[PDB]
Amino acid sequence: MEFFGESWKKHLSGEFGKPYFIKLMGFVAEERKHYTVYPPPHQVFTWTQMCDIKDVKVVILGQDPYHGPNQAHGLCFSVQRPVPPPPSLENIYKELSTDIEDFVHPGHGDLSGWAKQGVLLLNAVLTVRAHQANSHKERGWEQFTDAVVSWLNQNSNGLVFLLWGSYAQKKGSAIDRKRHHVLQTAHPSPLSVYRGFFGCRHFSKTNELLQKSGKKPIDWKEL
């Protein structure tokens, strides 16, 4: 597997030989001839290259990638420069602005600053065909990302999982709440933003739990 962090590879390698995965790769490779598929090859596993698997402290779960040009780059919620922040991300920025004292809207929507600090921004489905949302679902990705979540659940301790929305909350149903801290509320989308996200203060709380666990808090403004 190329474009895959070696420490993640040393722990998830067992997934690459399973038939569901071989078929998934076949299907993906296939579509990338007759459909424009996001994100580009070198950015499907960007989350694995941002930090070591053993340095992961916070996990934010998403769905599928942004189905438009220049957006998706292998991190959930993140859009690479110069793409302006999509509705959901702007609401996350809006929440952070009153939750974290020294926070300042970074103008951009690139979350690599968080990824480097140990904030895993993982999507459930890692690819999508340009302009068709949830197009690449039921192809094996969800099972692979399940494995990723599963490994972190068993082999890590005291991680903080931030689950926004029912989809994300379902994907994280199996997380051991006695071994990890889980925080859940409504999705930051304008439709549900007022249903609980605004005022959730998940960012301050995440840092509290971290410090209490003896780990360095996330500098949310470092974007």
């Binding site: 438009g68 999509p86 509705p87 949302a133």
Partner: protein
């Protein structure tokens, strides 16, 4: 496409920035009417009016329109079932 569906109902050509999948009751609590299937909230932002325009359809790959929701600056939702 879904964009021209939006332009049709608003007269403004909007760019879909994201499509968020949500569960029927998750949507019910917000919309007031419980959709029968999973809803994809296709959202575009109108800078002109400062409004969040959301075309709610069914899950891929049929994407049958179910509602058009318009949210204004004061956080008010304006539902328009299709």
């Amino acid at each position: 496409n879904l964009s021209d569906i939006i332009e049709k109902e608003t007269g403004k050509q909007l760019v879909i920035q994201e499509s968020i999948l949500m569960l029927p009751e998750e949507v019910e609590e917000v919309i007031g009417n419980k959709p029968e299937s999973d809803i994809l909230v296709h959202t575009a932002y109108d800078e002109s009016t400062d409004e969040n325009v959301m075309l709610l359809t069914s899950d891929a790959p049929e994407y049958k329109p179910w509602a058009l929701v318009i949210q204004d600056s004061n956080g008010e939702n304006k539902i328009k079932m299709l």
